[PDB]
Subunit: 99 residues, 3 copies
Amino acid sequence: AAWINEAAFRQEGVAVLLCVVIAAWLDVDAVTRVLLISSVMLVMIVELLNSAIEAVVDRIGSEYHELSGRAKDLGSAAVLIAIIDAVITWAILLWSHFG
Amino acid sequence: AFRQEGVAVLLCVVIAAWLDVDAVTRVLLISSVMLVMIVELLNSAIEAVVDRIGSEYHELSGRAKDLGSAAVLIAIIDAVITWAILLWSHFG
Amino acid sequence: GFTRIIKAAGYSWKGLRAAWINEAAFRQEGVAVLLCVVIAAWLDVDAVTRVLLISSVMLVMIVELLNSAIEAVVDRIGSEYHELSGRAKDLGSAAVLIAIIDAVITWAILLWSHFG
Ligand SMILES: CCCCCCC/C=C/CCCCCC(=O)OC[C@@H](O)CO
Ligand SMILES: CCCCCCC/C=C\CCCCCC(=O)OC[C@@H](O)CO
Ligand SMILES: CCCCCCC/C=C\CCCCCC(=O)OC[C@@H](O)CO
Ligand SMILES: CCCCCCC/C=C\CCCCCC(=O)OC[C@@H](O)CO
Ligand SMILES: CCCCCCC/C=C\CCCCCC(=O)OC[C@@H](O)CO
Ligand SMILES: CCCCCCC/C=C\CCCCCC(=O)OC[C@@H](O)CO
Ligand SMILES: CCCCCCC/C=C\CCCCCC(=O)OC[C@@H](O)CO
Ligand SMILES: CCCCCCC/C=C\CCCCCC(=O)OC[C@@H](O)CO
Ligand SMILES: CCCCCCC/C=C\CCCCCC(=O)OC[C@@H](O)CO
Ligand SMILES: CCCCCCC/C=C\CCCCCC(=O)OC[C@@H](O)CO
Ligand SMILES: CCCCCCC/C=C\CCCCCC(=O)OC[C@@H](O)CO
Ligand SMILES: CCCCCCC/C=C\CCCCCC(=O)OC[C@@H](O)CO
């Protein structure tokens, strides 16, 4: 409900969205296509969960606590691992596809 | 309801075993369903925190539940795309 | 932008570092994950199987980190509200254990079909 109107989410969304379109056009087999799409959708999923966690922390207050920062650091780490999994997925699958 | 969610899993698992597909297709079909559960469980956990922070509404209280529900939505969508693509290929 | 990434990549490193430093269980988990990838990378399998073997154990790490974040929130709130902090932790722990089960099963089935 109107969270999709922030810049960072739009660039993240459009990046993921763009990959799904690309994956939908590539001449690959079904299992590869599913994996190409799954890897980038997971990034969007995890980022949504990371932002959701961040919302809960900011909800509590602006006064800083060590665990408040750590929850955000762990959420970011989850996204990073997701992004790496996506790059690796496309790397392994689309290697030697152009030729 | 996780009660119906659990039976929904079994049905997908039963169908997955029913169809004459190889191990890779079988792992993809079921994992996608399992990812929904994981995200839902994670979303439900986030919700449990929000609800005890306060019984009041806040800009950030409801913003979390939306982003969490969005994550579940994206997971369910990915699951449908997977079952569509694979079954289409299987019955090609 | 380019500077958003440096800032976000920095929080990620603090996340992984703090998670590593604070628990032996996490360190041993990261080792188990790291090995599994190395093994997956060297196996003589097709590209989709390779990705499946890698992708799954990665998901374990992802869910682990997300859950650890959620745990940090309920500990932040304090002792008083504990009981629904308990349910949030129970839910998140289910997500972690499910993901690990999926990883274990996936590796079993796939390595079975290949070596068998
Ligand atoms: C920084 C050095 C390591 C970086 C590794 C990243 C890309 C390489 C991945 C593994 C390639 C090394 C050979 C292992 C392997 O894949 O065996 C498969 C074999 O069937 C043909 O290569
Ligand atoms: C209610 C709207 C839901 C989405 C609208 C319909 C989308 C059409 C198909 C579902 C996913 C297709 C994505 C993959 C694709 O385009 O390749 C198709 C081809 O691989 C079939 O094997
Ligand atoms: C500066 C623009 C960057 C664009 C993003 C990168 C583009 C990636 C791939 C471009 C080619 C699209 C795939 C076309 C293709 O493989 O053909 C599919 C097959 O059905 C042809 O009959
Ligand atoms: C080796 C060839 C790879 C070809 C491209 C594969 C890219 C796959 C996934 C990357 C898309 C991630 C989109 C989300 C994103 O970047 O936002 C996260 C970050 O900007 C927020 O801090
Ligand atoms: C185009 C951008 C590249 C981005 C960097 C990707 C680094 C991460 C993982 C590297 C794994 C790719 C190699 C996998 C592979 O298929 O080996 C090559 C082999 O198929 C050729 O015989
Ligand atoms: C021969 C086997 C096919 C017969 C069709 C019977 C289908 C029965 C159950 C299908 C799976 C149940 C769970 C899937 C599901 O609920 O997806 C809905 C999803 O959009 C979440 O609302
Ligand atoms: C060919 C028949 C099988 C179709 C399988 C398609 C898989 C789609 C979704 C899999 C996950 C099921 C999750 C069910 C769910 O969360 O719905 C419950 C809720 O929406 C009802 O209020
Ligand atoms: C050899 C390594 C295997 C392939 C992975 C290579 C890494 C490629 C791109 C990663 C850089 C993007 C950094 C994204 C990031 O900072 O995450 C943001 C997140 O933590 C908070 O939104
Ligand atoms: C194969 C692609 C991803 C490979 C990594 C899989 C899991 C990701 C990270 C595992 C934990 C890395 C954190 C290491 C770290 O920060 O330790 C610092 C500490 O030892 C300093 O004393
Ligand atoms: C908690 C248990 C998780 C354990 C994590 C580390 C062990 C997991 C997988 C490693 C066992 C694979 C052994 C088979 C293998 O490596 O194939 C050999 C292949 O290269 C044939 O030459
Ligand atoms: C925390 C981030 C750490 C990132 C770790 C980097 C990932 C390392 C290896 C993943 C890529 C494996 C490439 C597999 C490969 O090259 O084998 C190709 C072989 O089949 C040739 O036919
Ligand atoms: C077949 C053996 C059981 C395996 C369980 C896996 C089934 C799939 C999803 C179940 C997740 C369990 C989450 C339910 C739960 O924890 O509720 C209890 C707790 O949250 C408060 O009562």
